[PDB]
C-alpha cells in the first residue's frame with residue numbers, strides 16, 4: 161500500500177461521507193454506460209453532493225422477503241476498501257429495481273476497451289494480471305469471499321491508471337436470484353464449477369486466464385482459432401460448456417507471446433483445479449515478476465485507445 | 471394483411487423485457503400488450519416468414535389462449551396481443567406467494583394442458599412454455615401467451631434461421647439444451663416445460679433450488695446428470711399427479727406423453743378427489 165494509493169483510498173472515504181441516504185429523487189441521469197443481461201448502468205450525478213457515480217439497475221422478479229435480504233447483504237460492500245476493488249457508495253431498492261451505486265470508472269470495462277483495441281499488448285496484460293491477482297487476494301483474505309465471475313466485463317479501468325474488480329458474489333441471495341436468467345452466449349466458468357461445487361479461488365484463476373487469452377488475441381478462445389485464422393494475426397452455448405469440460409484447454413499462439421506469458425496462462429488453464437496454480441504461486445511467477453518491474457504507461461495507453469488526450 | 475399502421479397504437483408505460491422483446495401497455499380499441507421485438511431490422515426473407523407465422527397465430531381462438539391481435543412494422547417491428555389483468559402464474563407462485571387450495575392448483579394445471587392441447591391440435595409448438603407466460607385472468611381462467619413465433623426468435627443469417635437457444639433454462643428440455651438435432655423443439659419439448667410448470671405448482675419452488683450457477687444447470691441438464699428433485703413435492707399432493715409430472719420430465723423425449731393423454735390424466739384425478 162504505497163503513498164499514492166493511500167491518498168486515493170482516504171480521498172474516497174471523504175467523498176463517501178458527503179453521501180447520506182440514497183434516494184431515487186437525488187439523482188440526475190447524465191448518460192448510459194453499458195447494458196448487459198445483468199442490468200443497465202447509467203452515469204448519474206448525486207445532487208445532494210454533486211458526486212458523479214455509476215448506477216447499476218438490476219430488475220429482478222423476486223419476492224420482497226428475498227429482495228430486502230439482497231439489499232441487506234449488499235451492505236458488506238461498505239467494508240470492501242482496496243485500490244483493486246471498485247468503490248461502493250450504497251445500494252437501495254426503488255420502482256421495482258435494485259440500484260447499486262458504485263464509483264465512476266471513466267475508462268470502462270476491459271471488454272469495451274478490447275473492442276476499441278482489437279488486441280491488448282502483453283505488457284499491458286501484465287499489469288492487468290497483477291491487479292486481478294491482488295484483487296482476488298484482498299477478497300480472499302480480508303473478506304473470505306470468492307469472485308465467482310471474473311471476466312473482461314468485470315475488470316474496470318480509469319484514466320488514473322487504476323485497474324479494479326467489480327460485480328463479485330458478495331450477496332448469496334443475489335447469486336441464487338440471478339440463477340433464473342436467460343441463457344448467455346459465452347461462459348467463463350471453470351470446468352469444476354460446470355460439474356459441481358467449485359475449488360475456491362482456484363476457479364476464479366481459470367476465468368482470469370481465459371479472460372487473458374481472449375484479450376491477448378481479441379477473440380473468445382472457445383473454440384480455439386480455426387484454420388489460418390491464427391496466422392491472420394457460431395458454437396452453441398451447451399457445446400461451449402461441453403468443450404470446456406471434455407476438451408483440452410485453450411492456449412496462446414507459440415510465436416507471438418513470450419514464454420513467460422504462455423506458461424502463465426497455461427498454469428491458469430489446467431483443467432484439474434488442484435494442479436492449477438493458486439494466488440501464492442501466480443504472485444511469484446516469472447511473467448508477474450517481470451511485468452511488475454516494467455514501467456509501462458497504462459493510463460496513457462488507455463486514453464490513446466479510446467481516443468482521448470492523456 | 472394483418473398489419474397495423476402507425477398512429478393507431480398508443481404506446482404507454484414500459485412493463486419489462488423477456489427472452490425476445492420488451493412489452494409496453496398500449497391502447498388499440500382497448501388495452502393491448504405491445505411487445506417491441508428484438509429483431510429491429512428484419513430481412514425481407516425473415517419478414518415474409520414472420521407474416522406467414524402471424525397468419526397461423528391469427529386463426530387461433532381458444533379460451534385458454536391469449537388473443538393474438540396481429541403485428542406492426544411502422545416505428546419498429548412489434549407484436550400486439552391482448553392485455554390481461556392480474557399477475558402471471560410466476561408472480562403468484564414465486565413473488566406474491568398466493569395460497570391456493572389443492573383443487574385450485576389442479577384446476578390451473580387442467581386449463582393449461584387444455585390450452586396446450588389446442589395449440590398442438592393446430593400443430594403449433596409453444597417453444598417457451600413457463601409460468602411467466604401463463605396469466606390468471608381475473609383469478610379464474612388460465613391464459614397462455616408468447617406461443618409460437620419461432621421466426622422472431624433466433625436471429626437470421628440471410629436465409630438460414632437456425633433455431634438458436636434463447637429463453638429460460640429451467641423449462642428447457644435436455645434435447646433442447648443441447649441443440650444438437652436442429653429441430654429439438656417438438657411437442658415433447660413443450661410437454662417437458664409443462665412438467666416443470668407442474669413442479670412449480672406442486673412444490674411452490676423453482677427447480678434446482680440448491681444450484682445457483684446458470685452454466686452448471688445448462689451443462690448438467692443437457693448431459694442428463696441433473697434432474698428436478700421430485701422430493702420437494704408437498705405432502706398434500708395426489709399420488710396420481712406426482713406420477714404424471716415424472717412422465718413429462720423424462721430425459722429422452724420419446725418417452726414423454728402427449729397432451730391428449732396428459733389432459734385426460736388431470737381430469738381423471740380432478741374428479742376422484
Ligand SMILES: CNS(=O)(=O)Nc1nccc(Cc2c(C)c3ccc(Oc4ncccn4)cc3oc2=O)c1F
Nearest residue numbers: 246260308309326327328329330331334335338683684
Ligand atoms: C457467473 N457467476 S455465478 O456465481 O454463477 N453468478 C454470480 N456471480 C457473481 C456475482 C453474482 C451476484 C452479484 C452481482 C451481479 C453484483 C453486481 C454488482 C455489485 O456491486 C458491486 N459494487 C462494487 C464492487 C463490486 N460489486 C454486487 C454484486 O453482488 C453479487 O452478489 C452472481 F449471481
Ligand SMILES: Nc1ncnc2c1ncn2[C@@H]1O[C@H](COP(=O)(O)OP(=O)(O)NP(=O)(O)O)[C@@H](O)[C@H]1O
Nearest residue numbers: 193194195196197198199200201214265268269313
Ligand atoms: N462503473 C462503470 N463504469 C464504466 N462502465 C461500466 C461500469 N459498470 C458497467 N459498465 C459497462 O456497462 C456494460 C454492462 O454492464 P453489465 O450490466 O454488468 O453487463 P455485463 O457485465 O457487461 N455482461 P452481463 O454480466 O452478462 O450482464 C459493460 O460492458 C461495462 O463496460
Ligand SMILES: Nc1ncnc2c1ncn2[C@@H]1O[C@H](COP(=O)(O)OP(=O)(O)NP(=O)(O)O)[C@@H](O)[C@H]1O
Nearest residue numbers: 485486487488489490493503552553554558602616
Ligand atoms: N399480454 C400481456 N399482458 C400483460 N402483461 C404482459 C403480457 N405479456 C407479458 N407481460 C408482462 O410483461 C413483462 C415481460 O414479459 P415478457 O417480455 O413476455 O418476458 P417473459 O414472459 O418473462 N419471458 P418470455 O415471454 O419468454 O419473453 C412481465 O412482467 C409480464 O408479466
Ligand SMILES: [Mg+2]
Nearest residue numbers: 196313314327
Ligand atoms: Mg458485469
Ligand SMILES: [Mg+2]
Nearest residue numbers: 602603615616
Ligand atoms: Mg410472457
